[PDB]
Structure 1
Amino acid sequence: FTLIELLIVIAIIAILAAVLIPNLLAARKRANDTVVTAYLNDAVKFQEMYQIDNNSYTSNQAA
């Protein structure tokens, strides 16, 4: 094992470190939109439950 093999190893590490890491921001954006969609789907279920009890929809989240 010699300095030229070790420079090749360092060079290839620099390549793999650059390319094998995903765009984390783009991944989290799509997960975050799923949270919003899921929370609105829940708010919709609870608007219908409030409608069962009160014959009207809520304007306030605490209800």
Structure 2
Amino acid sequence: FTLIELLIVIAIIAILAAVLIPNLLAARKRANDTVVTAYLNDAVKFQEMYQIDNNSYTSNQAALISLGLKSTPANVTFSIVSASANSYCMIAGHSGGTVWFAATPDKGVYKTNTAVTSSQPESCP
């Protein structure tokens, strides 16, 4: 067991420790988008359930939570823009996500061009 045989093993550990460790930040961004997309997909369901009861759409979040929807997820900024009798607009996004996600009845849940680092969209596209 030489020093050179130990020294080359130390050299390879430095190489393997760099390359084999994956990009963590990028992997979480897409998982964070799934949380935003899932919560908006759930939000659309409980909007339709409130439409059965009251014949309208909710401006406030507490109305949707009372019917059955969960509380806002960790590091997520859910915010309903507006809700008329026969329409709605719900913007939501994760802090370390990719982009903001809108949610309307005609277009469904989709993603906008605005970044999560930038400010919240005033109205959905």
Q: Deviations over 1:12-60 (max 9, x none)?
A: 0000000000000000000000000000000000000000000000000
| Superposed CA RMSD | 0.3
Higher-RCO chain (CA-CA 8 Å, sequence separation at least 6): 2
Query: What residue ranges of structure 1 are gaps of 5+ in the alignment?
Result: none
Q: Which has the higher strand share?
A: 2
Question: What's the counterpart of residue 43 of structure 1?
Answer: 43
CA distance in 2, matches of 1:22, 1:31: 15
Question: What's the counterpart of residue 57 of structure 1?
Answer: 57
CA distance in 1, matches of 2:14, 2:6: 12
CA distance in 1, matches of 2:7, 2:13: 10
- How many residues were matched structurally? 60
Q: Which has the higher helix share?
A: 1
CA distance in 1, matches of 2:11, 2:4: 10
Identity of aligned residues (%): 100
Q: 1:3: how far off?
A: 0.3
CA distance in 2, matches of 1:2, 1:37: 57
Runs of 4+ in 1 over 3 A off after TM superposition: none
Q: TM-score, normalised by structure 1?
A: 0.94
Which protein shows a greater Rg? Answer: 1
Q: TM-score, normalised by structure 2?
A: 0.48
- Aligned with 1:56: secondary structure? coil
Q: 1:2: how far off?
A: 0.8
